[PDB]
C-alpha cells in the first residue's frame, strides 16, 4: 500500500524500486500582459526518478516544446510524467526493472497505473513521507542541464556522489533528504553552508562537495540548525 515511517527500511532492501517526483515537470513564471491580463510562460522542467538504494537518478528533461498547443497543462503534465516513466521501465533490461514505483504525489497514481497496465507485477504506491525532491532544481548542476536543454533529453546521475563507498544507503538517503530539505527551506543559506569554505570543492563528476566524514557531520549539523532556525522564524518561536 502506502509507504510511511513504519516501513521506511523497505527503501534499502534488495527489491529494485524507484521514487517518481513530478513537482518540477511543468514549471511556469506568471506575468502581466501588455493589456494588463495575466499569462504564463513555461520553462524547462524535469522528472525526478530516483533509486534510493543505489543513488541512480534518471533525470528526464521536459523541454517547453512539449507543451506547445496543448491544453490543461497541469493535468497533461501528470500523464506525460507517467508516459516517460513507463518508457524508461520498458527501456531497461528485465532484471533492472523496478518491482515498485513510489510516487511522491497521489495525483500521479492513476496516470502511472494506466501507463503501466502492461506491467501488472510492478506495484504503484503512494507515500506518506514528505520528501523534499522539489528542491532538486536547487542543485546547480541539475538546474544547469535542465535550463540549457534545447530538446527532450535524459541525463543520468548518481545523486549520492561516492558516499556509498563509506556509508550505507539508509544514511545516504538521510543525508540527501536533509540537504534537500535545507535547500527547500532556505536555499541561500544552505548553499552558503555548502560552499563557504574555498578549500572544499565539487569534483567535476559529482553534485556535492568533497567533504570528509568529520566535515559531513559538521555540515549535517549546520543544515539541521538552518531548518530549525527557519522554523522559529516562520512560527515566531
Amino acid at each position: 500500500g502506502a509507504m510511511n515511517s513504519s516501513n521506511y527500511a523497505e527503501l534499502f532492501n534488495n527489491d529494485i524500486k524507484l521514487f517518481v517526483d513530478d513537482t518540477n515537470v511543468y514549471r511556469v513564471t506568471v506575468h502581466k500582459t501588455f493589456e494588463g491580463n495575466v499569462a504564463t510562460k513555461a520553462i524547462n522542467g524535469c522528472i525526478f526518478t530516483l533509486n534510493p538504494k543505489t543513488g541512480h537518478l534518471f533525470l528526464k528533461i521536459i523541454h517547453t516544446s512539449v507543451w506547445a498547443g496543448q491544453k490543461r497543462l497541469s493535468q497533461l503534465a501528470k500523464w506525460k510524467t507517467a508516459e516517460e516513466v513507463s518508457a524508461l521501465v520498458r527501456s531497461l533490461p528485465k532484471e533492472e526493472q523496478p518491482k515498485q514505483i513510489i510516487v511522491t504525489r497521489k495525483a500521479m497514481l492513476d496516470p502511472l497505473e494506466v501507463h503501466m497496465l502492461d506491467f501488472p507485477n510492478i506495484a504503484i504506491r503512494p507515500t506518506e513521507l514528505r520528501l523534499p525532491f522539489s528542491a532538486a532544481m536547487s542543485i546547480d548542476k541539475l538546474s544547469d542541464v535542465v535550463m540549457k536543454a534545447t530538446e527532450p533529453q535524459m541525463v543520468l546521475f548518481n545523486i549520492y556522489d561516492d558516499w556509498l563507498d563509506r556509508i550505507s544507503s539508509y544514511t545516504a538517503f538521510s543525508r540527501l533528504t536533509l540537504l534537500l530539505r535545507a535547500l527547500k527551506t532556505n536555499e541561500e543559506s544552505a548553499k552558503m553552508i555548502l560552499l563557504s569554505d574555498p578549500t572544499i570543492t565539487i569534483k567535476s563528476y559529482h553534485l556535492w562537495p568533497s567533504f570528509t566524514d568529520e566535515q559531513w557531520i559538521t555540515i549535517e549539523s549546520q543544515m539541521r540548525d538552518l531548518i530549525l532556525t527557519e522554523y522559529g522564524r516562520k512560527y515566531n518561536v
Partner: protein, 300 residues
C-alpha cells in the same frame, strides 16, 4: 393473462411479484398469482418470515412455458418448476381460480412502471447472465457473486455480467492512455457497444436487470454492475443522442421505484454526484437529475 400457481404455502413468507409484494401466513390457503401481464419478463421473489437471510426468486416469461411454485422441505425454499402437461396445468389453474385461492397481479391501467423498468430486458439475455440451461426460468438470490467479484467462488452459481473495468487493457488503447481514461467513448462505443453487446438495447437490458436484482434481492454485485454501466456512459464525451435520452428515462423510473428507505444501500454517492454534476453528461440527464434532487437531496 397468465398465472403462476402454487402447490401450497407451508412456511410463512413475503412473496414479491415484480414491484408488488404481499405476506402469506404459515399454511395459509394460498395457491398462486393470476392475471400476470403477457409481454414482459417477470420476477417472483421470496423472503422467509422466520429467516430474512437470502432473499431469492425466479425470472420468467409466461410465453416460454407453464411455471408453478412448490415448497421443497429438504432444501427449505420455494422452487419454480415447469409443467409440461398443458391440459393438467389448465385444469389445476382453473380449480384454483374457481376457489378464489389466488392473488391478482395488481396492475393499475395508467401504470407503465413495470414496462419502464424492463423495456430492454429479455429472457434470452437473462439466461446468459444466469447459467442453468435445463430450466427456462432463472434463479437469483441475495448472495450470488458476479464473475467480476470472483476475479478479485463457485463458477456455476455466478452472475455473468459483462466485466467493466476502467483500469484494464480492454478499456485503454496503448498510446491513448490519457485520452481513453479521461474520455471513455472508445470503451463505450467500440469495445462494449459494437464489440460485446452489439447494440444499445442489449446494454440497457443488462443495466436494467442489474438494477432489478440489486433492488429486489439486495444483491451487492448487481448494484456494482448497475453503477458501472451508468458511469461508463456518463464518462464518455461521445454518446448517441437517442442513448442519452433513453438512459435518462431508464434511470428516472429506477430512481422513482426505489424504496426511499433503501437509498443508503442502493445508491453510490460518488457515482451519482460524478454523473450528475461533473461528467460529460452532467447536463444530459434532466429527468433523472430532477427526481434525484427532489427525492434524495442528501446523497448529493
Amino acid at each position: 393473462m397468465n398465472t403462476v400457481p402454487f402447490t401450497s404455502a407451508p412456511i410463512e413468507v413475503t412473496i414479491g411479484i415484480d414491484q408488488y409484494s404481499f405476506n402469506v401466513k404459515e399454511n395459509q390457503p394460498f395457491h398462486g398469482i393470476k392475471d400476470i401481464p403477457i409481454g414482459h419478463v417477470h420476477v417472483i421473489h421470496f423472503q422467509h418470515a422466520d429467516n430474512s437471510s437470502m432473499r431469492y426468486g425466479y425470472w420468467f416469461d409466461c410465453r416460454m412455458g407453464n411455471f408453478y411454485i412448490q415448497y421443497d422441505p429438504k432444501d427449505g425454499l420455494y422452487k419454480m418448476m415447469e409443467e409440461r402437461d398443458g391440459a393438467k396445468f389448465e385444469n389445476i389453474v382453473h380449480n384454483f381460480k374457481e376457489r378464489q385461492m389466488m392473488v391478482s397481479y395488481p396492475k393499475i391501467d395508467e401504470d407503465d412502471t413495470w414496462y419502464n423498468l424492463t423495456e430492454f430486458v429479455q429472457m434470452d439475455k437473462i439466461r446468459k447472465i444466469v447459467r442453468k440451461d435445463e430450466n427456462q426460468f432463472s434463479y437469483v438470490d441475495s448472495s450470488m457473486t458476479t464473475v467480476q467479484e470472483n476475479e478479485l467462488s463457485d463458477p456455476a452459481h455466478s452472475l455473468n455480467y459483462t466485466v467493466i473495468n476502467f483500469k484494464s487493457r480492454e478499456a485503454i488503447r496503448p498510446g491513448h492512455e490519457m485520452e481513453d481514461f479521461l474520455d471513455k467513448s472508445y470503451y463505450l462505443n467500440t469495445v462494449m457497444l459494437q464489440g460485446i453487446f452489439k447494440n444499445s438495447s442489449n446494454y440497457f437490458g443488462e443495466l436494467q436487470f442489474a438494477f432489478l436484482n440489486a433492488m429486489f434481492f439486495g444483491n451487492y454485485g448487481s448494484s456494482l454492475q448497475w453503477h458501472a454501466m451508468i458511469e461508463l456512459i456518463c464518462s464518455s464525451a461521445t454518446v448517441p443522442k437517442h442513448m442519452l435520452d433513453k438512459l435518462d428515462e431508464i434511470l428516472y423510473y429506477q430512481i422513482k421505484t426505489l424504496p426511499e428507505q433503501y437509498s443508503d444501500i442502493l445508491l453510490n454517492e460518488r457515482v451519482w454526484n460524478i454523473c450528475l454534476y461533473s461528467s460529460f453528461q452532467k447536463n444530459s440527464l434532466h429527468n433523472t437529475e430532477k427526481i434525484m434532487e427532489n427525492k434524495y437531496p442528501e446523497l448529493l
